[PDB]
Inverse folding.
């Protein structure tokens, strides 16, 4: 099947996926040209190398984003950065 | 911190650190010279509260991990000696 999606107003106790904007500009990371901002989302809820065996509401599928940024050497980098967007949440 | 250690068959519900041996020789990775076997451990237990991780809910996860040095083949009479990061769980906690 699929993962569950929730808003800030859900009274959902199970492993669910919530919206979240990651703001690089707000972090102050100005070496990042684009994007200044993107939708990352996150996982939260209960479940009835990485060293965790216990079930946990974790991203079960993530997708990359393309970024444009400085290394400060008059060197601008355009790259595909993996695992930046939580597309789906589930337990282990 | 929240560093509890448990052995197997422990009666424990809280976030604890359990033993686990990773055994390259028994697994058959004969290209791995050393270590043949090492203590990796893992985290397990419940966590109460009243970017490429993207998890907010509390979870029993390693709060500290350490590397191991490995000696292995690429099969070209090429033996590689390197520091391999995050291979040993040293401590477990909720965050």
């Amino acid at each position: 099947d699929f993962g569950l999606d929730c808003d800030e107003h859900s009274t959902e106790s199970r492993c669910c996926r919530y919206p979240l904007t990651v703001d690089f500009e707000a972090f102050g990371w100005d070496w990042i040209i684009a994007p200044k901002r993107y939708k990352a989302n996150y996982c939260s809820g209960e479940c009835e190398p990485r060293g965790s065996a216990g079930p946990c509401c974790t991203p079960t599928k993530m997708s990359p984003i393309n970024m444009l940024y400085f290394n400060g050497k008059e060197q601008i980098i355009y790259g595909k950065i993996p695992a930046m967007v939580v597309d789906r949440c589930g337990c282990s």
In short: The first strand of chain B starts at residue 16 and ends at 18. Residues 24-27 of chain B form the longest helix (4 residues).
